[PDB]
Design an enzyme around this catalytic site. Structure first.
Site, PDB file in Angstrom:
ATOM      1  CB  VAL A  59      88.771  48.655 -68.308  1.00  0.00           C
ATOM      2  CG1 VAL A  59      88.496  48.561 -69.808  1.00  0.00           C
ATOM      3  CG2 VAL A  59      89.834  49.680 -67.988  1.00  0.00           C
ATOM      4  CB  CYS A  60      83.127  47.710 -68.943  1.00  0.00           C
ATOM      5  SG  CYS A  60      81.820  46.770 -69.619  1.00  0.00           S
ATOM      6  CB  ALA A  61      87.125  43.635 -71.310  1.00  0.00           C
ATOM      7  CB  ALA A  62      83.087  44.193 -75.515  1.00  0.00           C
ATOM      8  CB  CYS A  94      80.117  46.069 -66.284  1.00  0.00           C
ATOM      9  SG  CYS A  94      81.961  45.730 -66.481  1.00  0.00           S
TER      10      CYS A  94
END
Lengths: 167, 167
Positions: A59-62, A94
């Site tokens: 998951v790419c947490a903002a 990311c």
């Protein structure tokens, strides 16, 4: 030792995270090409140690990349995204994509780093991983901000870290 | 110590891999759900330790899954695919999914395993990873086949391992 939480459950973390005022301990960690990277290779820069249980969670947490970006828009700053993930797994991270002066580093052959920096999880399923933590080191290797995040799955005080970095 | 090769360059491997005739030492490693797995949990079975520098290299050679499937088609056999990758990364391996009795296991908080089994890369950029090796352990916990592969990027003698498991 310290206590943090995972799924609001209590997790022991070894030793004590370095406190502002103290001298940062030297370290060696491993870069994405398997070279050794030392704290001394960043002499005279401000350094953010951005320490994660994993950077390979899918998951790419903002909020991760946002902080990394704000931090490296401040002149003479590098952000070191550190975890126990191997370099093979960190290579596609990311939060460092598209950003200069953001470098991923692994602890897989340098477990003493996690002990020295008071971020080694000592028990439970995450034993052997790093706690969530942010440590800011100035140009002369003095710690100027540290935080051991109370709930491993929640954000550090990025605003407070960024304020120190500028000031 | 022992010497193998990585793209032709010599690599030191600590101690000595157990030879046919050796007593298999107990170990504990970590499964995909972060639980601890021991050798003793496979009592009564034959175990193949299929040991890799990494199972997260971005390339899945077809020979890897083929061996795992052929081995586990032999009655009373489990294949333990072992590496230093964290359990998070071991999900990208092509050789265990959908094969009963093929299990991925991580060394990330059990570095003693690699020492005890004579598979710890001691120098070079791969220091801290496992060498490529196959170790076949029988129902009496004796080692009946082992190979420390000469070139870490090349296949073990899978034919020999399969033969020892049949006979």
């Amino acid at each position: 030792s310290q206590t943090v939480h995972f799924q609001g459950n209590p997790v022991t973390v070894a030793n004590s995270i370095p406190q502002a005022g103290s001298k940062a301990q030297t370290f060696t960690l491993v870069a994405k090409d398997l070279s050794d990277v030392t704290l001394g290779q960043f002499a005279g820069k401000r350094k953010v140690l951005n320490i994660f249980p994993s950077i390979d969670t899918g998951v790419c947490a903002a909020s991760v990349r946002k902080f990394n970006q704000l931090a490296t828009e401040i002149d003479n700053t590098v952000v070191l995204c550190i975890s126990a993930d191997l370099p093979f797994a960190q290579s596609r991270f990311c939060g460092a994509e598209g950003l200069n002066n953001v470098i991923t580093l692994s602890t897989f052959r340098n477990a003493e780093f996690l002990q020295a920096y008071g971020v080694a999880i000592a028990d439970g399923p995450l034993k052997g991983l790093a706690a969530r933590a942010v440590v800011v080191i100035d140009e002369n290797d003095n710690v100027i901000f540290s935080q051991l995040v109370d709930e491993i799955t929640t954000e550090p005080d990025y605003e407070a870290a960024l304020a120190v970095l500028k000031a």
